[PDB]
């Protein structure tokens, strides 16, 4: 009675794999027509060139990431992934070449289906490896906000407040922008809704927090003025904001159909 | 009209996939298909999903069969999506229409992924293979669900229709 997420959780993963699988599907059909029906598999030079075209970009554009990112888990696991893809292409190419000589060659049919399997497996690894890093990038930024909200209770002067504000404002703009781009990618509508409502709530608590802090400093600096509630008011806002950011962090981690299983 | 292919004895079948097809079939078989293409596309799908429950393991000589099955399923999904949009366009009801519109957004995502997953499973015909199966079964179940939900929102949308309209799904029960 509840919606389980899709297997491919971002539009990017889905859009890049779909055409690779479409092309691969024809190769798989001819491979079985050779094996089962025993037909001479025709010249696959072209279909294999198209298959390559579909991924050489992804390998290319992903090799321009181990040179544009800082994530060490990415630099570590990205390469094993190109190599898997690249090797499967090489196999695919040999099968075409081999079947171009003997439309009945069996060592080539093993290369055809093996390269086919490898290409889909490797492209999936590449994409999920980019995504996992994307999620680490975002969560680290929300986390940075959580930490700063934690410092609010230390601001006791207008001079500090003015400094606090100066830093918190931007960090909130970055997180907002990232969460917006992220949500535009999710394939699961429900996670997009939760992300958007939490960001909205966080955006509106911002001004209340700063104001609760202004009033705190002002009251703390007055003579014989109580600050107990000015205090609670600030702390209360910090806690609602923190809960929203934590909710955003939680949803951002819902990227495995596995964990939302039937 | 057609009946649900009961699982024969000594048959390798993905039970999660079969059960879900059985239930989608049960929902749809309550309606006559005459004057209702969504109900007919639903029955068609239930049956294709039943066949796919027999294909996941399948083994030798079943790759094409699997890729073709996914293909026909997607084609049926497309038709269900397309008909639900048209039903929604004429729905006066704000809530019903919203729900209807929601699935005409979900179904395409699911059907696109079912085709990708069917293909990646066909290249494997092991842990990895087993995961390919589980991913496929998870997706297929999302599809059966969305379609069942589509059948119901569209039936409710036939109660409150637009006067200026040119479209009508016939919703007549089948009595046993």
UniProtKB/Swiss-Prot annotation, chain B:
Residues 54-97, 165-176 are annotated as: Facilitates phospholipid membrane insertion. It comes from the Eukaryota. Signal peptide: none annotated. Transmembrane segments: none annotated. Residues 1-176 are annotated as: C-terminal tail. It is found in: Cell membrane; Cell junction, Adherens junction; Cell junction, Focal adhesion; Cytoplasm, Cytoskeleton. It is linked to Cardiomyopathy, dilated, 1W: A disorder characterized by ventricular dilation and impaired systolic function, resulting in congestive heart failure and arrhythmia. Patients are at risk of premature death. Cardiomyopathy, familial hypertrophic, 15: A hereditary heart disorder characterized by ventricular hypertrophy, which is usually asymmetric and often involves the interventricular septum. The symptoms include dyspnea, syncope, collapse, palpitations, and chest pain. They can be readily provoked by exercise. The disorder has inter- and intrafamilial variability ranging from benign to malignant forms with high risk of cardiac failure and sudden cardiac death. Belongs to the vinculin/alpha-catenin family. This is Vinculin. The lineage of its organism: Eukaryota, Metazoa, Chordata, Craniata, Vertebrata.
């Amino acid at each position: 009675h509840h919606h389980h997420m899709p297997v491919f959780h971002t539009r990017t993963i889905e859009s890049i794999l779909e055409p690779v699988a479409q092309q691969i599907s024809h190769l798989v059909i001819m491979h079985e027509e050779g094996e089962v029906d025993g037909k001479a598999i025709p010249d696959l030079t072209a279909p294999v060139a198209a298959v390559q075209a579909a991924v050489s970009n992804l390998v290319r554009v992903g090799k321009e990431t181990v040179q544009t990112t800082e994530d060490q888990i990415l630099k570590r696991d990205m390469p094993p992934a190109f190599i898997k893809v690249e090797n499967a292409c090489t196999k695919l190419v040999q099968a075409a070449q081999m079947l171009q000589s003997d439309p009945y060659s069996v060592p080539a049919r093993d290369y055809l289906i093996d390269g086919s399997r490898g290409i889909l497996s490797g492209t999936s690894d590449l994409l999920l490896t980019f995504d996992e890093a994307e999620v680490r990038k975002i969560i680290r930024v929300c986390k940075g906000i959580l930490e700063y909200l934690t410092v609010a209770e230390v601001v006791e002067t207008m001079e500090d407040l003015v400094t606090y504000t100066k830093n918190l404002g931007p960090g909130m703009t970055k997180m907002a922008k990232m969460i917006d781009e992220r949500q535009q990618e999710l394939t699961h509508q429900e996670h997009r809704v939760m992300l958007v409502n939490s960001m909205n709530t966080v955006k509106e608590l911002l001004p209340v927090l700063i104001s609760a802090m202004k009033i705190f400093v002002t009251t703390k600096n007055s003579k014989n003025q109580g600050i107990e509630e000015a205090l609670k008011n600030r702390n209360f806002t910090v806690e609602k904001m923190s809960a929203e950011i934590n909710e955003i962090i939680r949803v951002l981690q819902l990227t495995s159909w596995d964990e939302d299983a039937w | 009209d057609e009946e649900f292919p009961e699982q024969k004895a000594g048959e390798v079948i993905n039970q999660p996939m079969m059960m879900a097809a059985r239930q989608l079939h049960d929902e749809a078989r309550k309606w006559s298909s005459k004057g209702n293409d969504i109900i007919a596309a639903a029955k068609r799908m239930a049956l294709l999903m039943a066949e796919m429950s027999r294909l996941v393991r399948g083994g030798s000589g079943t790759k094409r069969a699997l890729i073709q099955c996914a293909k026909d399923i997607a084609k049926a999904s497309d038709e269900v999506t397309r008909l639900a949009k048209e039903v929604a366009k004429q729905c006066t009801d704000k809530r019903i229409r919203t729900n209807l519109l929601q699935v005409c957004e979900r179904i395409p995502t699911i059907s696109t992924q079912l085709k990708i997953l069917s293909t990646v499973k066909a290249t494997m015909l092991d842990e990895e293979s087993e995961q390919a199966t589980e991913m496929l079964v998870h997706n297929a179940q999302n599809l059966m669900q969305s379609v069942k939900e589509t059948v119901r929102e569209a039936e409710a949308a036939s109660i409150k229709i637009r006067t200026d309209a040119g479209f009508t799904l016939r919703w007549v029960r089948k009595t046993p």
